[PDB]
Structure formats: C-alpha cells, structure tokens
Amino acid sequence: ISVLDVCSRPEMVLLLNKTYYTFSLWEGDCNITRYNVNETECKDNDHPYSCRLWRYREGKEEVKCLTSDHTRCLYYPEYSNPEALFDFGFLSYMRNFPGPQCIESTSIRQQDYEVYSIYQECKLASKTYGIDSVLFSLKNFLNYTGKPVNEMPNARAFVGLIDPKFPPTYPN
Amino acid sequence: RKCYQEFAHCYLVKYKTPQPWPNEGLIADQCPLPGLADVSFYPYQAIWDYYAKIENIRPANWTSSKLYGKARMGSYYIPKRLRNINNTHILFCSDVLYS
C-alpha cells in the first residue's frame, strides 16, 4: 500500500493499515518554527514554495461581529491559511522543490491476520451441494448488513462484520 | 463460470484481536483540495467526503468540538462508524489491491 492510496481509497487504509505514518507539513509540528526554518533541512529553487511552509499560525479561535443581526457573524480560524491555495503538499510530494516535511509513526495493529477467499469456497463447496443453493446462501451472506457488496463501487467497497459465520448452513 | 461471475474478487480478512482506529481526526495532505469552485481542476478525490471546509458564518458561541472533534481546522474528520471496537472481520470485493 502506497502513501497516496490513503486519499484515493481512504476506507481500506483506515481499516487495514497497521502503521499510521502521518505526513506533517504545517507549522508547529515536528519542532519546526518560522524563526528557525533556515537554521534547522534545506541548506539553501526557481519556485516560491522552496523551503516554504503551507499553514501558518495567526492566533486562536476568536469571534468578532457587531452587525445588526446576530446570525451572520464573522469567524476566525485557529490555523490560518496565508494563501488559501490547494496544490502545495501534492507538488511537494513529487520532490520538485525543497521544504520542511515530517513523517510520524504510530502503531495500531499487530498479530498478522488470516485471509479467506469466497471464490475458492464457492468452487470447492459446489462439488457436493446444489450449486444454486450455495450461490443463494453465499449471496445472502454477502447481504448480511442489508447492502450488497457487489452493488457498491469497485474503488471503495469495504465493510466491517461482527463475528459472521463462514460458511453458512445450506438448506437440505 | 457462475462462481467467477458472482464472487470473483471477494475476500474476507480476520484479525487476532479486535482493534479499531484510535485517532479521531486524520492529518494527511498528500493530494490537493477543492478550494471553492464547484468543478475543481483536479479530479474528484475520495477524501473530500471527510473535508473540514472553512466556514464563514457561525454563531458567537460556536465551538470546534460540536462536529469536527479534535481534528485541526481544514483537516479530515472521520466518523465513529469506521472505528467500532467490536469490528472483527472485514469483507471486500475489489481488484485495486492485486499485484
């Protein structure tokens, strides 16, 4: 599993990844501050974002408004955006310009899993039982939560199950 | 033919100890953001369903813990349904993980 997959198929990375390698680029994390970016690790281009940061610290959460109506009120974000752009980290991932970056590790899951293939069970269990019954029961098992897995898109089709029985009993 | 047409890419993975996602707000900016235009230059990403877009109008007594949790503003917020403690098996039918 690559790094980018986390924002192309987020569900599988959330539900299957063992190590959480978060990518920090904002100011403040990983002991990097505006007053020591140069002296901490690019030493010294042709790009405004070279050795530059993305999200800045302007203050804290404050709300100020004295307008006639109390509903529509101005808001101050706590982590301000000095540019309000959207293509900073993505370009930084391609190693085209230098700049701060910090990868953090956090373990969640261990104890290597076990994988079962439904197709192999369909093939093997069909040599002794009526294949129509096996297909119907396996389709019912796939619809345990009331939503068919095949219906949901290919890119994001992942469900969590609370102790399902495998394989289910088939009618006589 | 029948088994392949039905459940070709279906698999089920099983843990040893049930362990859900510990964190509440995901911090990851490896791919771009919509900005403000309806039709962004980049294709519609799958992480934008969790985006914490910057809001302009909010009451004075508004707080960041009502719906965005501990996540920093502008990051991605995930719901509790993806980190149930009792989730023990995972089922998936897709081919985006082959060699």
Side-chain angles (χ1 to χ4, degrees), chain A residues 1-40 42-44 47-171, chain B:
Chain A
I1 312 175
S2 63
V3 174
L4 289 160
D5 284 287
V6 74
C7 80
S8 179
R9 303 149 272 274
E11 295 90 325
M12 52 146 287
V13 183
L14 283 183
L15 293 167
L16 292 168
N17 208 341
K18 268 173 171 223
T19 77
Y20 174 36
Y21 287 3
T22 188
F23 193 52
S24 75
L25 177 54
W26 297 17
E27 194 270 328
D29 297 89
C30 193
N31 298 340
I32 286 286
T33 309
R34 291 190 294 268
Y35 321 107
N36 49 67
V37 289
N38 206 327
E39 290 85 359
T40 303
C42 60
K43 181 60 175 170
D44 200 25
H47 198 92
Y49 304 151
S50 281
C51 303
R52 191 186 173 276
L53 286 79
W54 196 2
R55 303 314 195 192
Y56 274 48
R57 291 273 319 121
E58 267 188 14
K60 295 197 55 51
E61 176 153 317
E62 288 172 346
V63 177
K64 290 179 181 178
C65 57
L66 57 86
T67 74
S68 65
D69 198 280
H70 197 62
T71 305
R72 308 269 152 275
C73 179
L74 195 145
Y75 176 74
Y76 290 86
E78 80 275 6
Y79 270 79
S80 291
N81 299 351
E83 63 182 344
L85 297 198
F86 62 93
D87 48 355
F88 190 92
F90 189 63
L91 298 200
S92 313
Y93 191 84
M94 319 294 168
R95 294 183 185 174
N96 49 0
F97 52 80
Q101 58 209 258
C102 186
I103 44 171
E104 287 299 320
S105 173
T106 293
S107 88
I108 298 93
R109 307 182 176 93
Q110 312 93 355
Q111 311 307 314
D112 51 348
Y113 317 115
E114 309 208 308
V115 190
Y116 302 141
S117 163
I118 301 193
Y119 164 69
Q120 184 69 26
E121 180 73 18
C122 188
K123 183 176 181 177
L124 194 146
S126 285
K127 293 187 287 184
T128 52
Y129 292 165
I131 66 170
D132 290 330
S133 167
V134 182
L135 192 147
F136 184 32
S137 185
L138 272 182
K139 222 161 190 179
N140 191 2
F141 165 77
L142 195 74
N143 211 15
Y144 176 75
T145 81
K147 311 176 185 179
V149 178
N150 303 351
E151 184 65 29
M152 356 178 316
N154 183 31
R156 297 173 293 184
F158 297 80
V159 302
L161 299 187
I162 318 304
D163 196 8
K165 193 50 193 66
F166 197 71
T169 307
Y170 300 163
Chain B
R1 184 221 307 171
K2 275 301 168 204
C3 286
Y4 192 92
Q5 263 177 266
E6 294 289 340
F7 292 164
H9 309 304
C10 285
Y11 308 89
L12 188 137
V13 306
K14 187 255 287 182
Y15 301 159
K16 292 179 108 23
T17 66
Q19 43 195 349
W21 198 240
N23 189 359
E24 182 77 27
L26 182 70
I27 298 170
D29 48 354
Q30 299 95 357
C31 51
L33 307 102
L36 61 86
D38 187 276
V39 178
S40 64
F41 170 77
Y42 285 89
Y44 178 85
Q45 302 303 321
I47 203 66
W48 292 354
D49 267 6
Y50 306 82
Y51 189 33
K53 210 179 180 84
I54 299 185
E55 276 308 282
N56 184 241
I57 51 172
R58 272 166 175 165
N61 284 337
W62 182 92
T63 181
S64 58
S65 281
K66 50 159 55 56
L67 60 84
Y68 277 145
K70 295 179 178 180
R72 322 177 176 183
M73 182 58 185
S75 160
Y76 302 102
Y77 176 80
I78 64 169
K80 164 169 175 66
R81 64 182 179 179
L82 305 179
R83 51 200 177 75
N84 293 96
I85 188 166
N86 58 318
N87 291 3
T88 182
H89 297 166
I90 294 179
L91 191 153
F92 71 102
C93 305
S94 166
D95 58 71
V96 298
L97 203 62
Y98 280 144
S99 180

